[PDB]
């Protein structure tokens, strides 16, 4: 098919199961991209589903804080996902290696996360798997933009209509509604944003236990706090936002729009 003839393959960029990604060049255009090479038939029945989903849903999102898919392509026993090239790594690498972010830079960070997420919800897409590992930095530059990635677990919703889309995502960042087989929708992303914002500011998550059972219990209960000392110097509006995001009833939980208006993110 098209990939072999249009795209020239370069260095090894990253790995992830039966899918090596490489820097590639659309030769005629000259422009360079990240091309996710994926083994076909080494993959499972469910994996091909999550691939169509990824392809379809990414080919829906035009935003500077969402990694753009430029071309989904299938050939002999290999599928090709062509993305915006990004060399700033995961937001996880950067948090880990900087302990935490200042309020200034945490606000600047979750702002971009909130706008990406809002475009997502405007095109009726819910991501269900926001986390520092699934957020990428444009380049190694200071100030480099934050680009939302990995839509393998993303789902399309119809208007503001809620439903059981299955138990899917990541133990730490999962919403209470999901933990209670409740019909869920747009708001599960905000819960996830809350968790990220807490991490951002102190460098650890609000909910965590060595026993999944106890982790899901405290998540379900909204059982987080803002410990001393670290949390003592932190503006009470920053905390406010996190309450409004880690609100436990998704009805009265804050939206992506409401949040981008909040004084902790807006005046910035």
């Amino acid at each position: 098919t098209r990939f072999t003839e249009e795209y020239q393959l370069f260095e090894e960029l990253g790995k992830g199961a039966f899918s090596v990604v490489r820097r590639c060049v659309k030769v005629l255009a000259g422009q360079e991209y990240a091309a996710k090479i994926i083994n076909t038939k080494k993959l499972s029945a469910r994996d091909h589903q999550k691939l169509e989903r990824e392809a379809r849903i990414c080919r829906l999102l035009k935003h500077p804080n969402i990694v753009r898919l430029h071309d989904s392509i299938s050939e002999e026993g290999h599928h090709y996902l062509i993305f915006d090239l990004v060399t700033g790594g995961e937001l996880f690498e950067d948090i880990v290696a900087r302990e935490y972010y200042s309020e200034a830079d945490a606000s600047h960070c979750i702002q971009q996360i909130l706008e990406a997420v809002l475009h997502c919800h405007q095109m009726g897409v819910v991501h269900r798997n926001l986390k520092p590992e699934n957020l990428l930095l444009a380049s190694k530059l200071k100030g480099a933009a934050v680009k939302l990635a990995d839509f393998g677990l993303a789902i399309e919703v119809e208007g503001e209509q809620q439903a059981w889309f299955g138990f899917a995502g990541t133990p730490g960042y999962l919403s209470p509604e999901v933990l209670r087989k409740d019909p869920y929708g747009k708001p599960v992303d905000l819960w996830a944003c809350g968790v990220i914002l807490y991490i951002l500011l102190v460098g650890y998550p609000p909910f965590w236990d060595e026993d999944q059972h106890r982790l899901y219990k405290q998540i379900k209960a909204g059982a987080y706090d803002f410990p001393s000392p670290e949390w003592d110097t932190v503006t009470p509006e920053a905390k406010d936002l996190i309450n409004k995001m880690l609100t436990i009833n998704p009805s009265k939980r804050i939206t992506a729009a409401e949040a981008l208006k909040h004084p902790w993110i807006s005046h910035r």
Partner: peptide
């Protein structure tokens, strides 16, 4: 405090 380590994405309820 609690720990920031990396976590993986599940497609189903896998009780750990």
């Amino acid at each position: 405090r609690n720990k920031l380590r990396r976590q993986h994405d599940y497609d189903t309820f896998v009780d750990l």
